[PDB]
Amino acid sequence: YTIAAL
Amino acid sequence: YTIAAL
Amino acid sequence: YTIAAL
Amino acid sequence: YTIAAL
Amino acid sequence: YTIAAL
Amino acid sequence: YTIAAL
Amino acid sequence: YTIAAL
Amino acid sequence: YTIAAL
Amino acid sequence: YTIAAL
Amino acid sequence: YTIAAL
Amino acid sequence: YTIAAL
Amino acid sequence: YTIAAL
Amino acid sequence: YTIAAL
Amino acid sequence: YTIAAL
Amino acid sequence: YTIAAL
Amino acid sequence: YTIAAL
Amino acid sequence: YTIAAL
Amino acid sequence: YTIAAL
Amino acid sequence: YTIAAL
Amino acid sequence: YTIAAL
């Protein structure tokens, strides 16, 4: 499970 | 910009 | 399950 | 497997 | 912008 | 910019 | 900006 | 489990 | 395995 | 800039 | 800025 | 377990 | 195994 | 700048 | 600034 | 267990 | 094994 | 600058 | 500034 | 084994 917020 | 992979 | 919001 | 290029 | 989910 | 990998 | 999750 | 906040 | 390049 | 690896 | 978690 | 705060 | 280069 | 490794 | 945790 | 504060 | 270079 | 190794 | 803990 | 060079 990967999450990225830019 | 948000991305999530489960 | 992948989700991306731009 | 998820890949995103911006 | 390219996205691929496998 | 935040990223988390589980 | 490139992100890949395997 | 890795998390980074910039 | 997650990799991100900004 | 904070990073944690568990 | 590059980050990889294995 | 490693943590770094800059 | 986590590696980050800034 | 603080770093801890356990 | 480079950090690696194994 | 190592800790350094700068 | 943790290594950081600033 | 403080460092402790246990 | 370099630090390594083994 | 810990080593730090400033």
Short mmCIF file of N, CA and C in Angstrom, two decimals:
data_model
loop_
_atom_site.label_atom_id
_atom_site.label_comp_id
_atom_site.label_asym_id
_atom_site.label_seq_id
_atom_site.Cartn_x
_atom_site.Cartn_y
_atom_site.Cartn_z
N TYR A 1 0.82 -1.21 0.00
CA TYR A 1 0.00 0.00 0.00
C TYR A 1 0.86 1.26 0.00
N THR A 2 0.78 2.01 -1.09
CA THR A 2 1.57 3.22 -1.27
C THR A 2 0.65 4.40 -1.47
N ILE A 3 0.97 5.52 -0.82
CA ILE A 3 0.22 6.74 -1.01
C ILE A 3 1.19 7.92 -1.07
N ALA A 4 0.95 8.82 -2.02
CA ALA A 4 1.75 10.02 -2.17
C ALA A 4 0.84 11.21 -2.42
N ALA A 5 1.13 12.30 -1.71
CA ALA A 5 0.37 13.54 -1.86
C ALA A 5 1.33 14.68 -2.10
N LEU A 6 1.10 15.37 -3.21
CA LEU A 6 1.99 16.43 -3.66
C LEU A 6 1.27 17.78 -3.62
N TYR B 1 -1.98 16.92 -6.13
CA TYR B 1 -1.89 15.64 -6.81
C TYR B 1 -1.69 14.49 -5.83
N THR B 2 -2.70 13.62 -5.75
CA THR B 2 -2.69 12.50 -4.82
C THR B 2 -2.80 11.20 -5.59
N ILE B 3 -2.02 10.21 -5.20
CA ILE B 3 -2.10 8.89 -5.80
C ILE B 3 -1.97 7.83 -4.70
N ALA B 4 -2.83 6.82 -4.79
CA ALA B 4 -2.80 5.71 -3.85
C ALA B 4 -2.95 4.40 -4.60
N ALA B 5 -2.11 3.43 -4.26
CA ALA B 5 -2.16 2.11 -4.87
C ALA B 5 -2.22 1.07 -3.78
N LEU B 6 -3.25 0.24 -3.85
CA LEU B 6 -3.52 -0.76 -2.83
C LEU B 6 -3.37 -2.17 -3.39
N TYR C 1 -6.14 -1.96 -6.53
CA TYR C 1 -6.96 -0.75 -6.53
C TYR C 1 -6.10 0.51 -6.53
N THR C 2 -6.18 1.26 -7.63
CA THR C 2 -5.39 2.47 -7.80
C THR C 2 -6.31 3.65 -8.00
N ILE C 3 -5.99 4.77 -7.36
CA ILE C 3 -6.74 5.99 -7.54
C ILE C 3 -5.77 7.17 -7.60
N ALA C 4 -6.01 8.06 -8.55
CA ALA C 4 -5.21 9.26 -8.71
C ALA C 4 -6.12 10.46 -8.95
N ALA C 5 -5.84 11.55 -8.25
CA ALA C 5 -6.60 12.78 -8.39
C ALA C 5 -5.63 13.92 -8.63
N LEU C 6 -5.86 14.62 -9.74
CA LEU C 6 -4.98 15.68 -10.19
C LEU C 6 -5.69 17.03 -10.15
N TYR D 1 0.65 -3.55 -9.50
CA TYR D 1 1.73 -2.71 -10.01
C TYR D 1 1.19 -1.43 -10.64
N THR D 2 1.51 -0.31 -10.02
CA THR D 2 1.03 1.00 -10.47
C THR D 2 2.21 1.89 -10.78
N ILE D 3 2.13 2.61 -11.89
CA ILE D 3 3.15 3.57 -12.25
C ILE D 3 2.48 4.84 -12.80
N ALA D 4 2.98 5.98 -12.36
CA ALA D 4 2.50 7.27 -12.82
C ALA D 4 3.67 8.19 -13.11
N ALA D 5 3.61 8.87 -14.25
CA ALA D 5 4.64 9.81 -14.65
C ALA D 5 3.99 11.12 -15.02
N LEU D 6 4.43 12.18 -14.35
CA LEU D 6 3.85 13.50 -14.49
C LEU D 6 4.86 14.46 -15.11
N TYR E 1 0.99 13.38 -18.83
CA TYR E 1 0.64 12.62 -17.64
C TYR E 1 0.13 11.23 -17.99
N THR E 2 0.90 10.22 -17.60
CA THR E 2 0.57 8.83 -17.90
C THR E 2 0.43 8.05 -16.62
N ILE E 3 -0.59 7.20 -16.55
CA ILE E 3 -0.78 6.33 -15.40
C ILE E 3 -1.21 4.95 -15.89
N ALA E 4 -0.62 3.92 -15.30
CA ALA E 4 -0.96 2.55 -15.62
C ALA E 4 -1.07 1.74 -14.33
N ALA E 5 -2.13 0.94 -14.24
CA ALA E 5 -2.36 0.09 -13.09
C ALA E 5 -2.61 -1.32 -13.57
N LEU E 6 -1.80 -2.24 -13.06
CA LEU E 6 -1.82 -3.63 -13.49
C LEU E 6 -2.27 -4.53 -12.34
N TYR F 1 4.98 17.67 0.41
CA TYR F 1 5.08 16.39 -0.28
C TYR F 1 5.27 15.24 0.71
N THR F 2 4.27 14.38 0.79
CA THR F 2 4.28 13.25 1.71
C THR F 2 4.16 11.96 0.94
N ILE F 3 4.95 10.96 1.33
CA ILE F 3 4.86 9.65 0.73
C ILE F 3 4.99 8.59 1.83
N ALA F 4 4.14 7.57 1.75
CA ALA F 4 4.17 6.46 2.68
C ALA F 4 4.01 5.15 1.93
N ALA F 5 4.85 4.18 2.28
CA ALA F 5 4.80 2.86 1.67
C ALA F 5 4.75 1.82 2.76
N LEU F 6 3.72 0.99 2.69
CA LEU F 6 3.44 0.00 3.71
C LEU F 6 3.60 -1.41 3.14
N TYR G 1 7.95 14.13 -12.30
CA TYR G 1 7.61 13.37 -11.11
C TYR G 1 7.09 11.98 -11.46
N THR G 2 7.86 10.97 -11.07
CA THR G 2 7.53 9.58 -11.37
C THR G 2 7.39 8.80 -10.08
N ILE G 3 6.37 7.95 -10.01
CA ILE G 3 6.18 7.09 -8.87
C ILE G 3 5.75 5.70 -9.36
N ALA G 4 6.34 4.68 -8.77
CA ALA G 4 6.00 3.30 -9.08
C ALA G 4 5.89 2.49 -7.80
N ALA G 5 4.83 1.70 -7.71
CA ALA G 5 4.60 0.84 -6.56
C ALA G 5 4.35 -0.57 -7.04
N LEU G 6 5.16 -1.49 -6.53
CA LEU G 6 5.14 -2.88 -6.96
C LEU G 6 4.69 -3.78 -5.81
N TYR H 1 7.78 -0.45 6.53
CA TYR H 1 6.96 0.75 6.53
C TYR H 1 7.82 2.01 6.53
N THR H 2 7.74 2.76 5.44
CA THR H 2 8.53 3.97 5.27
C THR H 2 7.61 5.16 5.06
N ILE H 3 7.93 6.27 5.71
CA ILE H 3 7.18 7.50 5.53
C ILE H 3 8.16 8.67 5.46
N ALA H 4 7.91 9.57 4.52
CA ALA H 4 8.71 10.77 4.36
C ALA H 4 7.81 11.97 4.12
N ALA H 5 8.09 13.06 4.82
CA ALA H 5 7.33 14.29 4.68
C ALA H 5 8.29 15.43 4.43
N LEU H 6 8.07 16.12 3.33
CA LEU H 6 8.95 17.19 2.88
C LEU H 6 8.23 18.53 2.92
N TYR I 1 7.62 -2.80 -2.97
CA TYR I 1 8.69 -1.96 -3.48
C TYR I 1 8.16 -0.68 -4.11
N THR I 2 8.47 0.45 -3.49
CA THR I 2 7.99 1.75 -3.94
C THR I 2 9.17 2.64 -4.25
N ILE I 3 9.09 3.37 -5.36
CA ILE I 3 10.11 4.33 -5.72
C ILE I 3 9.45 5.59 -6.26
N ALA I 4 9.95 6.74 -5.82
CA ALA I 4 9.46 8.02 -6.29
C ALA I 4 10.63 8.95 -6.57
N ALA I 5 10.57 9.62 -7.72
CA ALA I 5 11.60 10.56 -8.12
C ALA I 5 10.95 11.87 -8.48
N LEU I 6 11.39 12.93 -7.81
CA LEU I 6 10.81 14.25 -7.95
C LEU I 6 11.82 15.22 -8.57
N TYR J 1 11.95 18.43 6.94
CA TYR J 1 12.04 17.14 6.26
C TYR J 1 12.23 16.00 7.24
N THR J 2 11.23 15.13 7.32
CA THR J 2 11.24 14.01 8.25
C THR J 2 11.12 12.71 7.48
N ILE J 3 11.91 11.71 7.87
CA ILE J 3 11.83 10.40 7.26
C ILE J 3 11.95 9.34 8.36
N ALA J 4 11.10 8.33 8.28
CA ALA J 4 11.13 7.22 9.22
C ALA J 4 10.97 5.91 8.46
N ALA J 5 11.81 4.94 8.81
CA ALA J 5 11.77 3.62 8.20
C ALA J 5 11.71 2.58 9.29
N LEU J 6 10.68 1.74 9.22
CA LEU J 6 10.40 0.75 10.24
C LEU J 6 10.56 -0.66 9.67
N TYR K 1 14.92 14.89 -5.77
CA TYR K 1 14.57 14.13 -4.57
C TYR K 1 14.06 12.73 -4.93
N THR K 2 14.82 11.72 -4.53
CA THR K 2 14.50 10.33 -4.84
C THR K 2 14.35 9.56 -3.55
N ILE K 3 13.33 8.71 -3.48
CA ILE K 3 13.14 7.84 -2.33
C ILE K 3 12.71 6.46 -2.82
N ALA K 4 13.31 5.43 -2.23
CA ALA K 4 12.96 4.05 -2.55
C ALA K 4 12.85 3.24 -1.27
N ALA K 5 11.79 2.45 -1.17
CA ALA K 5 11.56 1.59 -0.02
C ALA K 5 11.31 0.18 -0.50
N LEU K 6 12.12 -0.73 0.00
CA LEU K 6 12.10 -2.12 -0.42
C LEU K 6 11.66 -3.03 0.72
N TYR L 1 14.75 0.30 13.07
CA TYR L 1 13.93 1.51 13.07
C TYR L 1 14.78 2.77 13.07
N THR L 2 14.70 3.52 11.98
CA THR L 2 15.50 4.73 11.80
C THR L 2 14.58 5.91 11.60
N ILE L 3 14.89 7.03 12.25
CA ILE L 3 14.14 8.25 12.06
C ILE L 3 15.12 9.43 12.00
N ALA L 4 14.87 10.32 11.05
CA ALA L 4 15.68 11.52 10.90
C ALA L 4 14.77 12.72 10.65
N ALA L 5 15.05 13.81 11.35
CA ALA L 5 14.29 15.04 11.21
C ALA L 5 15.25 16.18 10.97
N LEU L 6 15.03 16.88 9.86
CA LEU L 6 15.91 17.94 9.41
C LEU L 6 15.20 19.29 9.45
N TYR M 1 14.58 -2.05 3.57
CA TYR M 1 15.66 -1.21 3.06
C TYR M 1 15.12 0.07 2.42
N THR M 2 15.43 1.20 3.05
CA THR M 2 14.96 2.50 2.60
C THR M 2 16.14 3.39 2.28
N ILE M 3 16.05 4.12 1.17
CA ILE M 3 17.08 5.08 0.81
C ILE M 3 16.41 6.34 0.27
N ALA M 4 16.91 7.49 0.71
CA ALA M 4 16.42 8.78 0.24
C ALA M 4 17.59 9.70 -0.04
N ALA M 5 17.53 10.37 -1.18
CA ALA M 5 18.57 11.32 -1.58
C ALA M 5 17.91 12.63 -1.95
N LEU M 6 18.36 13.68 -1.28
CA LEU M 6 17.78 15.00 -1.42
C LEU M 6 18.78 15.97 -2.04
N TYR N 1 18.91 19.18 13.47
CA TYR N 1 19.00 17.90 12.79
C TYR N 1 19.19 16.75 13.78
N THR N 2 18.19 15.88 13.85
CA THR N 2 18.20 14.76 14.78
C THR N 2 18.08 13.46 14.01
N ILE N 3 18.87 12.47 14.40
CA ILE N 3 18.79 11.15 13.80
C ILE N 3 18.91 10.09 14.90
N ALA N 4 18.06 9.08 14.82
CA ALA N 4 18.09 7.97 15.75
C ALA N 4 17.94 6.66 15.00
N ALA N 5 18.77 5.69 15.34
CA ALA N 5 18.73 4.37 14.73
C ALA N 5 18.67 3.33 15.83
N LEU N 6 17.64 2.50 15.76
CA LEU N 6 17.36 1.50 16.78
C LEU N 6 17.52 0.09 16.21
N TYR O 1 21.88 15.64 0.77
CA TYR O 1 21.53 14.88 1.96
C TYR O 1 21.02 13.49 1.61
N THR O 2 21.79 12.48 2.00
CA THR O 2 21.46 11.09 1.70
C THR O 2 21.32 10.31 2.99
N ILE O 3 20.30 9.46 3.06
CA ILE O 3 20.11 8.59 4.20
C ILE O 3 19.67 7.21 3.71
N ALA O 4 20.27 6.18 4.30
CA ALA O 4 19.93 4.81 3.99
C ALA O 4 19.82 4.00 5.27
N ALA O 5 18.76 3.20 5.36
CA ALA O 5 18.53 2.35 6.51
C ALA O 5 18.28 0.94 6.03
N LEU O 6 19.09 0.02 6.54
CA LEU O 6 19.06 -1.37 6.11
C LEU O 6 18.62 -2.28 7.26
N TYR P 1 21.71 1.05 19.60
CA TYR P 1 20.89 2.26 19.60
C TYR P 1 21.75 3.52 19.60
N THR P 2 21.67 4.27 18.51
CA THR P 2 22.46 5.48 18.33
C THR P 2 21.54 6.66 18.13
N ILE P 3 21.86 7.78 18.78
CA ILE P 3 21.11 9.00 18.60
C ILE P 3 22.08 10.18 18.53
N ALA P 4 21.84 11.08 17.58
CA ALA P 4 22.64 12.28 17.43
C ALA P 4 21.73 13.47 17.19
N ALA P 5 22.01 14.56 17.89
CA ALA P 5 21.26 15.80 17.75
C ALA P 5 22.22 16.94 17.50
N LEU P 6 21.99 17.63 16.40
CA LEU P 6 22.87 18.69 15.94
C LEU P 6 22.16 20.04 15.99
N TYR Q 1 21.54 -1.29 10.10
CA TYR Q 1 22.62 -0.45 9.59
C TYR Q 1 22.08 0.83 8.96
N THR Q 2 22.40 1.95 9.58
CA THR Q 2 21.92 3.25 9.13
C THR Q 2 23.10 4.14 8.82
N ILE Q 3 23.01 4.87 7.71
CA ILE Q 3 24.04 5.83 7.35
C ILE Q 3 23.37 7.10 6.80
N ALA Q 4 23.87 8.24 7.24
CA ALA Q 4 23.38 9.53 6.78
C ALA Q 4 24.56 10.45 6.49
N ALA Q 5 24.50 11.13 5.35
CA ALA Q 5 25.53 12.07 4.95
C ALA Q 5 24.88 13.38 4.58
N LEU Q 6 25.32 14.43 5.25
CA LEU Q 6 24.74 15.76 5.11
C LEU Q 6 25.74 16.72 4.49
N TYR R 1 25.87 19.93 20.01
CA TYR R 1 25.96 18.65 19.32
C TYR R 1 26.16 17.50 20.31
N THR R 2 25.15 16.64 20.39
CA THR R 2 25.16 15.51 21.32
C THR R 2 25.05 14.22 20.54
N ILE R 3 25.84 13.22 20.93
CA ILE R 3 25.75 11.91 20.33
C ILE R 3 25.88 10.85 21.43
N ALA R 4 25.03 9.83 21.35
CA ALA R 4 25.05 8.72 22.28
C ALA R 4 24.90 7.41 21.53
N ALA R 5 25.74 6.44 21.88
CA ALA R 5 25.69 5.12 21.27
C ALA R 5 25.64 4.08 22.36
N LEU R 6 24.61 3.25 22.29
CA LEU R 6 24.33 2.26 23.31
C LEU R 6 24.48 0.85 22.74
N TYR S 1 28.84 16.39 7.30
CA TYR S 1 28.49 15.63 8.50
C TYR S 1 27.98 14.24 8.14
N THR S 2 28.75 13.23 8.53
CA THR S 2 28.42 11.84 8.23
C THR S 2 28.28 11.06 9.52
N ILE S 3 27.26 10.21 9.59
CA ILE S 3 27.07 9.35 10.73
C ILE S 3 26.64 7.96 10.24
N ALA S 4 27.23 6.94 10.83
CA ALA S 4 26.89 5.56 10.52
C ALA S 4 26.78 4.75 11.80
N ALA S 5 25.72 3.96 11.89
CA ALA S 5 25.49 3.10 13.05
C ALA S 5 25.24 1.69 12.57
N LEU S 6 26.05 0.77 13.07
CA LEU S 6 26.03 -0.62 12.65
C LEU S 6 25.58 -1.52 13.79
N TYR T 1 28.50 -0.54 16.63
CA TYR T 1 29.58 0.30 16.12
C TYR T 1 29.04 1.58 15.49
N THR T 2 29.36 2.71 16.12
CA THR T 2 28.88 4.01 15.66
C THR T 2 30.06 4.90 15.35
N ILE T 3 29.98 5.63 14.24
CA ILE T 3 31.00 6.58 13.88
C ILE T 3 30.33 7.85 13.34
N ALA T 4 30.83 9.00 13.78
CA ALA T 4 30.35 10.28 13.31
C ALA T 4 31.52 11.21 13.03
N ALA T 5 31.46 11.88 11.88
CA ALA T 5 32.49 12.82 11.48
C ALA T 5 31.84 14.13 11.12
N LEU T 6 32.28 15.19 11.79
CA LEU T 6 31.70 16.51 11.65
C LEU T 6 32.71 17.48 11.03
#
